[PDB]
Curated annotation (Swiss-Prot):
Residues at which ATP binds: 12, 52-57
Name recorded for this polypeptide: ATP-dependent zinc metalloprotease FtsH
Swiss-Prot/TrEMBL domain comment: The open AAA+ domain (residues 126-400) probably allows nucleotide exchange and has the protease active site, while the closed domain is the active ATPase domain but the protease is inactive.
Coiled coil: none
Whole-protein coverage range: 148 to 393 of 624
Gene name of the record: ftsH
Organism for this UniProt entry: Thermus thermophilus (strain ATCC 27634 / DSM 579 / HB8)
UniProt KW keywords: ATP-binding, Cell inner membrane, Cell membrane, Hydrolase, Membrane, Metal-binding, Metalloprotease, Nucleotide-binding, Protease, Transmembrane, Transmembrane helix, Zinc
Any GO CC annotation of this UniProt entry: plasma membrane
UniProt GO BP: protein catabolic process; proteolysis
Principal location: membrane
Disulfide bonds: none
Function: Acts as a processive, ATP-dependent zinc metallopeptidase for both cytoplasmic and membrane proteins. Plays a role in the quality control of integral membrane proteins.
Signal peptide coordinates: none
Length: 238
């Protein structure tokens, strides 16, 4: 019931995405206004971009910026459940979401569902739940993927995820943020400059930054060293 603490001011980069999401935010902040105005918002937004680019974080920031609940679920989990259970769970998800107007329902790993009885049954239920939305339903469904081209076309038809928003690799601030988060718990030498590390890793995604630190940690750990140095980070980079 408590909206996330994360807001747009906490999201580095994604400047274009934020612009395109302004409309969703304003709707979530005052759904009654858009209803009375007879306006019409998507209700289905797909964030497109590579893994470790901050897609989930941004979606959470939308709920935070609008100070509205952020209800999460995983397409992966749904499909892992017994045949029919994933569908039943999809059903439970939207029934619960409807008791919290307005809100954001975020389906993680939509690829698992949109890309086998389990998957199909889960997908058909999601399709039905989305078509089941009335123009008055104060719900915005968000999802994320990097391969929108191999996604079941049905998920992109009008009334569903008919709004896509590109999310590129993190900018220098995004990378620094990712690096600082993953550096927690790792002993760094005084000469370690995470800000410089971010500047010198343009194009890197969350996974690369994570393996860079882990690989630096392993080197220092293997050589029996007590602290990770800037050189270790530079060596682990490639
Ligand atoms: Hg809702
Ligand atoms: Hg991360």
């Amino acid at each position: 019931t408590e909206a996330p603490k994360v807001t747009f001011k906490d999201v580095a980069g994604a400047e274009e995405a934020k612009e395109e999401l302004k409309e969703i935010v304003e709707f979530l902040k005052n759904p009654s206004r858009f209803h009375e105005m007879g306006a019409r918002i998507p209700k289905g937004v797909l964030l497109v971009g590579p893994p470790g680019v901050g897609k989930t974080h941004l979606a959470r920031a939308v709920a935070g910026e609008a100070r509205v609940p952020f209800i999460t679920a995983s397409g992966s989990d749904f499909v892992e459940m017994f045949v029919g259970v994933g569908a039943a769970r999809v059903r439970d998800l939207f029934e619960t979401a409807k008791r919290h107007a307005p809100c954001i329902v975020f389906i993680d790993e939509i690829d698992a569902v949109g890309r086998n009885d389990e998957r199909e049954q889960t997908l058909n239920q999601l399709l039905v739940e989305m078509d089941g939305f009335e123009k008055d339903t104060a719900i915005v469904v968000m999802a994320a993927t990097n391969r929108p081209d191999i996604l079941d076309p049905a998920l992109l038809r009008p009334g569903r995820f008919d709004r896509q928003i590109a999310i590129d690799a993190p900018d220098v601030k995004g990378r620094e943020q990712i690096l600082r988060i993953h550096a927690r718990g790792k002993p760094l030498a005084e000469d370690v400059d995470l800000a410089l590390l971010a500047k010198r890793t343009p194009g890197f995604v969350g996974a690369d930054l994570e393996n860079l630190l882990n690989e630096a940690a392993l080197l220092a750990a293997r050589e029996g060293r007590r602290k990770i140095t800037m050189k270790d980070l530079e060596e682990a980079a490639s």
